[PDB]
XYZ file of N, CA and C in Angstrom:
357
model
N -10.819 5.064 -13.525
C -9.604 4.255 -13.372
C -9.694 3.313 -11.942
N -10.451 2.437 -12.015
C -10.766 1.597 -10.830
C -9.703 0.712 -10.473
N -9.392 0.391 -9.311
C -8.155 -0.413 -8.894
C -8.284 -1.838 -9.404
N -7.124 -2.302 -9.596
C -6.859 -3.582 -10.100
C -6.671 -4.601 -8.885
N -7.598 -5.557 -8.598
C -7.601 -6.437 -7.556
C -7.138 -7.809 -7.916
N -6.370 -8.615 -7.020
C -6.065 -9.886 -7.329
C -6.266 -10.773 -6.110
N -6.221 -12.025 -6.269
C -6.256 -12.975 -5.233
C -5.390 -14.183 -5.605
N -5.031 -14.952 -4.541
C -4.009 -15.881 -4.549
C -4.114 -16.918 -3.265
N -3.184 -17.923 -3.567
C -2.919 -18.917 -2.626
C -1.419 -19.262 -2.736
N -0.843 -19.453 -1.401
C 0.509 -19.652 -1.079
C 0.586 -20.952 -0.195
N 1.926 -21.519 -0.496
C 2.189 -22.664 0.391
C 3.756 -22.407 0.588
N 4.131 -22.521 1.718
C 5.658 -21.974 2.186
C 6.293 -23.119 3.295
N 7.595 -23.506 2.983
C 8.111 -24.466 3.797
C 9.700 -24.222 3.755
N 10.326 -24.575 4.725
C 11.921 -24.311 4.769
C 12.403 -25.293 3.591
N 13.577 -24.691 2.991
C 14.455 -25.472 1.972
C 15.279 -26.290 2.519
N 15.356 -27.612 1.706
C 16.391 -28.554 2.370
C 17.835 -28.153 2.361
N 16.429 -21.167 -7.595
C 15.384 -20.501 -8.536
C 14.664 -19.366 -7.812
N 15.249 -18.156 -7.636
C 14.458 -17.014 -6.768
C 13.567 -16.398 -7.787
N 13.041 -15.363 -7.286
C 12.102 -14.643 -8.157
C 12.418 -14.263 -9.456
N 13.596 -13.723 -9.677
C 14.062 -13.051 -11.016
C 13.997 -14.098 -12.190
N 15.016 -15.125 -12.000
C 15.112 -16.251 -12.724
C 13.751 -16.872 -12.983
N 12.973 -16.991 -11.896
C 11.628 -17.319 -12.132
C 10.984 -16.430 -13.031
N 10.757 -15.020 -12.587
C 9.959 -14.072 -13.430
C 10.534 -13.808 -14.705
N 11.859 -13.990 -14.975
C 12.448 -13.823 -16.555
C 11.922 -15.044 -17.201
N 11.802 -16.346 -16.562
C 11.393 -17.419 -17.346
C 9.880 -17.278 -18.185
N 9.035 -16.410 -17.550
C 7.698 -16.360 -18.005
C 7.663 -15.915 -19.541
N 7.121 -16.661 -20.295
C 6.953 -16.237 -21.772
C 5.915 -15.187 -22.001
N 5.929 -14.438 -23.000
C 5.064 -13.216 -23.152
C 3.394 -13.516 -23.140
N 3.256 -14.523 -23.816
C 1.745 -14.970 -23.654
C 1.429 -15.604 -22.309
N 2.417 -16.286 -21.583
C 2.366 -16.509 -20.259
C 1.903 -15.220 -19.411
N 2.602 -14.264 -19.525
C 2.435 -12.944 -19.038
C 1.136 -12.230 -19.375
N 0.917 -12.457 -20.599
C -0.376 -11.676 -21.278
C -1.533 -12.327 -20.841
N -1.582 -13.619 -20.663
C -2.792 -14.203 -20.003
C -2.870 -13.665 -18.558
N -1.953 -13.574 -17.839
C -2.059 -13.339 -16.347
C -2.665 -11.869 -16.223
N -1.829 -10.801 -16.747
C -2.203 -9.619 -16.650
C -3.600 -9.031 -17.305
N -4.050 -9.992 -18.133
C -5.335 -9.644 -18.639
C -6.480 -10.301 -17.769
N -6.207 -11.352 -17.005
C -7.201 -12.068 -16.401
C -7.680 -13.511 -16.924
N -7.048 -13.889 -18.070
C -7.345 -15.022 -18.766
C -6.687 -16.263 -18.341
N -5.643 -16.308 -17.404
C -5.101 -17.406 -16.803
C -4.592 -17.197 -15.496
N -4.765 -18.073 -14.432
C -3.728 -17.834 -13.342
C -2.202 -17.984 -13.622
N -1.415 -17.457 -12.802
C -0.058 -17.690 -12.936
C 0.356 -18.257 -11.457
N 1.158 -19.458 -11.702
C 1.660 -20.185 -10.567
C 3.156 -20.356 -10.637
N 3.808 -20.142 -9.500
C 5.172 -20.060 -9.469
C 5.790 -20.859 -8.330
N 7.086 -21.136 -8.531
C 7.774 -22.051 -7.488
C 9.174 -21.172 -7.379
N 9.332 -20.679 -6.212
C 10.568 -19.900 -6.144
C 11.091 -20.114 -4.774
N 12.456 -19.935 -4.704
C 13.162 -19.850 -3.356
C 13.236 -18.431 -3.058
N 12.858 -18.036 -1.788
C 13.148 -16.613 -1.209
C 13.815 -16.827 0.234
N 14.940 -16.270 0.434
C 15.724 -16.508 1.638
C 15.913 -17.982 2.003
N 15.393 -18.249 3.015
C 15.595 -19.525 3.548
C 14.426 -20.575 3.229
N 13.552 -20.074 2.665
C 12.097 -20.631 2.501
C 11.888 -20.952 1.065
N 10.832 -21.861 0.789
C 10.521 -22.269 -0.452
C 9.198 -22.123 -0.614
N 8.693 -21.565 -1.882
C 7.264 -21.165 -1.932
C 6.617 -21.555 -3.129
N 5.400 -21.828 -3.041
C 4.515 -21.952 -4.121
C 3.579 -20.845 -4.044
N 3.266 -20.341 -5.232
C 2.278 -19.142 -5.254
C 1.419 -19.441 -6.395
N 0.150 -19.251 -6.353
C -0.751 -19.163 -7.451
C -1.432 -17.833 -7.323
N -1.576 -17.224 -8.459
C -2.086 -15.731 -8.652
C -3.098 -15.583 -9.710
N -4.172 -14.829 -9.353
C -5.104 -14.643 -10.459
C -5.653 -13.038 -10.324
N -5.466 -12.324 -11.416
C -5.931 -11.079 -11.401
C -7.529 -11.090 -11.539
N -8.195 -9.944 -11.227
C -9.715 -9.849 -11.158
C -10.269 -10.137 -12.616
N -6.605 0.583 0.320
C -4.963 0.633 0.479
C -4.588 -0.314 -0.550
N -3.421 -0.104 -1.401
C -2.471 -1.011 -1.975
C -1.961 -2.034 -1.044
N -1.628 -3.181 -1.650
C -0.979 -4.286 -0.936
C -1.863 -5.474 -0.820
N -1.540 -6.511 -0.012
C -2.199 -7.611 -0.003
C -2.771 -7.923 1.503
N -3.902 -8.604 1.598
C -4.231 -9.000 2.904
C -4.383 -10.574 2.821
N -4.130 -11.192 4.098
C -4.228 -12.622 4.045
C -5.650 -13.050 4.610
N -6.420 -13.934 3.650
C -7.730 -14.236 4.067
C -7.863 -15.636 4.796
N -6.897 -16.377 4.616
C -6.851 -17.581 5.614
C -5.397 -18.090 5.606
N -5.079 -18.721 6.737
C -3.634 -19.332 6.831
C -3.799 -20.524 7.808
N -2.765 -21.372 7.718
C -2.581 -22.708 8.444
C -1.011 -22.696 8.797
N -0.826 -22.809 10.015
C 0.450 -23.165 10.546
C 0.621 -24.685 10.636
N 1.212 -25.349 9.625
C 1.272 -26.897 9.696
C 2.260 -27.348 10.697
N 3.398 -26.671 10.865
C 4.601 -27.190 11.675
C 5.498 -26.043 11.668
N 6.560 -25.824 12.331
C 7.449 -24.822 12.344
C 8.019 -24.443 11.092
N 7.662 -23.120 10.575
C 8.205 -22.856 9.234
C 7.342 -23.340 8.035
N 6.174 -24.246 8.439
C 5.355 -24.699 7.332
C 3.981 -23.877 7.477
N 3.761 -23.049 6.375
C 2.485 -22.274 6.355
C 2.023 -22.385 4.948
N 0.644 -22.544 5.021
C -0.141 -22.221 3.752
C -1.273 -21.346 4.033
N -1.672 -20.660 2.951
C -2.901 -19.771 3.067
C -3.411 -19.240 1.850
N -4.467 -18.406 1.834
C -4.964 -17.621 0.754
C -4.990 -16.070 1.024
N -5.039 -15.247 0.047
C -4.970 -13.931 0.182
C -5.661 -13.137 -0.996
N -5.634 -11.788 -0.878
C -6.227 -10.966 -1.752
C -5.376 -9.592 -1.856
N -5.598 -8.817 -2.664
C -4.981 -7.505 -2.665
C -5.306 -6.698 -3.958
N -4.877 -5.410 -3.743
C -4.795 -4.393 -4.883
C -3.445 -3.982 -5.414
N -3.410 -3.705 -6.765
C -2.109 -3.471 -7.169
C -1.642 -1.951 -6.714
N -0.335 -1.787 -6.728
C 0.183 -0.407 -6.587
C -0.087 0.465 -7.933
N -0.598 1.665 -7.712
C -0.978 2.491 -8.873
C 0.301 2.691 -9.944
N 1.599 2.679 -9.440
C 2.488 2.959 -10.516
C 2.735 1.649 -11.229
N 2.144 0.564 -10.978
C 2.105 -0.717 -11.941
C 0.833 -0.697 -12.845
N 0.343 0.645 -12.945
C -0.740 0.643 -13.973
C -0.162 1.732 -15.119
N -0.430 1.367 -16.442
C 0.113 2.268 -17.281
C -0.881 3.460 -17.587
N -0.784 4.218 -18.547
C -1.519 5.463 -18.762
C -2.941 5.248 -18.923
N -3.399 4.138 -19.482
C -4.688 3.684 -19.666
C -5.329 2.957 -18.400
N -4.519 2.938 -17.348
C -5.216 2.304 -16.092
C -5.211 0.783 -15.973
N -4.620 0.137 -16.835
C -4.609 -1.371 -16.708
C -3.053 -1.829 -16.532
N -2.810 -2.937 -15.919
C -1.471 -3.314 -15.569
C -0.476 -3.151 -16.550
N 0.657 -2.467 -16.257
C 1.766 -2.349 -17.169
C 2.393 -3.786 -17.380
N 2.466 -4.131 -18.771
C 2.797 -5.415 -19.234
C 4.233 -5.812 -19.196
N 4.605 -5.836 -17.930
C 5.998 -6.275 -17.530
C 6.177 -6.991 -16.232
N 7.326 -7.599 -15.947
C 7.595 -8.453 -14.843
C 7.635 -7.750 -13.406
N 7.649 -6.368 -13.683
C 7.761 -5.506 -12.371
C 6.180 -5.656 -11.764
N 5.275 -5.619 -12.415
C 3.927 -5.781 -11.904
C 3.706 -6.853 -11.116
N 4.155 -8.129 -11.544
C 4.267 -9.254 -10.793
C 5.060 -9.369 -9.580
N 6.166 -8.588 -9.713
C 7.021 -8.552 -8.668
C 6.491 -7.617 -7.455
N 5.663 -6.594 -7.804
C 4.900 -5.857 -6.655
C 4.015 -6.591 -6.081
N 3.232 -7.547 -6.668
C 2.184 -8.503 -6.060
C 3.085 -9.594 -5.119
N 4.127 -10.112 -5.599
C 5.041 -10.776 -4.625
C 5.594 -10.070 -3.468
N 5.840 -8.839 -3.618
C 6.299 -7.878 -2.551
C 5.066 -7.682 -1.724
N 3.814 -7.361 -2.223
C 2.943 -7.268 -1.221
C 2.541 -8.326 -0.247
N 2.599 -9.656 -0.919
C 2.229 -10.809 -0.301
C 3.109 -10.912 0.968
N 4.559 -10.780 0.585
C 5.643 -11.077 1.680
C 5.533 -10.017 2.713
N 5.135 -8.710 2.243
C 5.048 -7.621 3.475
C 3.919 -8.108 4.440
N 2.768 -8.701 3.809
C 1.628 -9.142 4.611
C 1.886 -10.403 5.516
N 2.897 -11.159 4.963
C 3.439 -12.035 5.886
C 4.044 -11.669 7.202
N 4.566 -10.397 7.304
C 5.236 -9.927 8.361
C 4.245 -9.831 9.661
N 3.134 -9.521 9.509
C 2.170 -9.715 10.528
C 2.061 -11.131 11.043
N 2.142 -12.067 10.277
C 2.227 -13.503 10.668
C 3.444 -13.889 10.986
N 3.924 -15.160 10.988
C 5.125 -15.605 11.285
C 6.032 -15.899 9.909
N 7.259 -16.373 10.160
C 8.165 -16.728 9.161
C 9.041 -15.802 8.471
N 9.865 -15.179 9.291
C 10.836 -14.491 8.556
C 12.350 -14.199 9.557
């Protein structure tokens, strides 16, 4: 039951469609492509006071930032990777086919931003 890893790319900036409304909009084969590894998943969402683009691709739990740039105050982009939380794996060891799996990865990424700036 080897761990499930992911990589991604984020761009973030202040705001002049939050996660759920975004996450519920995903269609089943949209979801199916992503949790299988057959397609990246790319999102545009508001979180708090900021505005975020994230692209995600499936292959300690959590995420680690592999590169970032501070462009201007509140304006950051970068790249990351991480491992899924095990309770986002079904009985067969592969990611559970629902929107909570993707919300965990978004949670992992935002936790890893705490070490850097922007909250």
